[PDB]
Amino acid sequence: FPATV
Amino acid sequence: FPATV
Amino acid sequence: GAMGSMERASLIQKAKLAEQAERYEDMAAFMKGAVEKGEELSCEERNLLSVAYKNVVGGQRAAWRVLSSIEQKSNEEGSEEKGPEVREYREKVETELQGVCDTVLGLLDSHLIKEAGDAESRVFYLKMKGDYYRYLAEVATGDDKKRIIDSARSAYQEAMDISKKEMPPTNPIRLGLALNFSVFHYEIANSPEEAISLAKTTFDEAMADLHTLSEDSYKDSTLIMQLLRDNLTLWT
């Protein structure tokens, strides 16, 4: 899964 | 801390 | 609410303790209580709110993905019929996840967003609104799915517009917003080209503005820039 903050 | 199961 | 009798300052103090103890449900309940005192939140307080709920919903999402995967495998050819239990339990976790999302969106709507006049506060809250509609979108399968997706898009878009006008390209909130909106495009809106374009443009515009920063600000900005690069590497 892609990075989110 | 020591091991317990 | 059960935190109605506790001092705002004590709620904030306890949220910090909860974070240290990795008790994110408690942390969220304390921050909810703090928000419901009705005063605006500081930068640090906004961070505590976001950290708390990001961790809670993050755990829910991970669990939902495990269960959804098991459920999908159950409905494959040759798979033995095990009854309603997998669907039921996935639904239980889903309903809980939705409840948390609704809680956060509720706080944003009553009344954090309407009182947020500074770029940093308004962008941060609208980013959060985007995020929690995105989490709703991840589990949505019904009549309102398109409207959920649009609610996320609309919140992210307003945050984007303000951030472009009011914040430097290296501002960590602007960067984090762009990172997440890019993921929205890729994972939710079926727009991988929009996602890649946004990530790249955001990265490049930040690069160009790094020269203006102190060592500490440089560290902050480049940390999030690396996440943009990580996603680009994943997607290309």
Add this chain to the structure above:
Amino acid sequence: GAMGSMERASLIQKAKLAEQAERYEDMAAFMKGAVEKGEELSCEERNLLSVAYKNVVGGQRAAWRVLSSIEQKSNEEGSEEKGPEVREYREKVETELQGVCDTVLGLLDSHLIKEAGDAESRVFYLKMKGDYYRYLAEVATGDDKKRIIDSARSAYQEAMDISKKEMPPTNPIRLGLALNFSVFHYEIANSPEEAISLAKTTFDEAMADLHTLSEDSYKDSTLIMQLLRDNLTLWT
């Protein structure tokens, strides 16, 4: 109870799903519901019960230790007075921990232990009873502290006596019981020599019986033997 309307088999199925999703609170609630159906538990079911509650209380203990440490530092010389909040929150976590322990002890007393006639089931449940009194002991500071410690000792002792008579020295339940009773001696009863003696004798007696085992049983037993050795290394 809220699980009263759900089939025993469905509760067990969902406990397994919860484990896969690392949802240990759910896992525990499902296993509680299963126990409350009133039928004896199988070996696998006993494991699900223990895993669920070990993880829940394990998280509580870790949190309590973080908070207790912060609280102890607050009451050192020169430390600034920050108010009742650290004590209050430590007490909140403590009260929750105690509630979980009481819940497990309740299940054991009503009526898992009294119906457990086989060595493996009776020893496993008495070990659990020892464990959950030991967790109560970790946080106890009052009039009943000595009685809590004795309740743990008594449960472990009965389990020890049965295990020595009815089980081989390599039996994983016998080994796990000995491991934990040894830790009880070291950490709770202020008896480090008893702890070391028990660990060593248990290790050596198991070593001597390894020749009787299959490859799979050998793996099972040696895994727990290594934990005994780990503790001995820590304590000597």
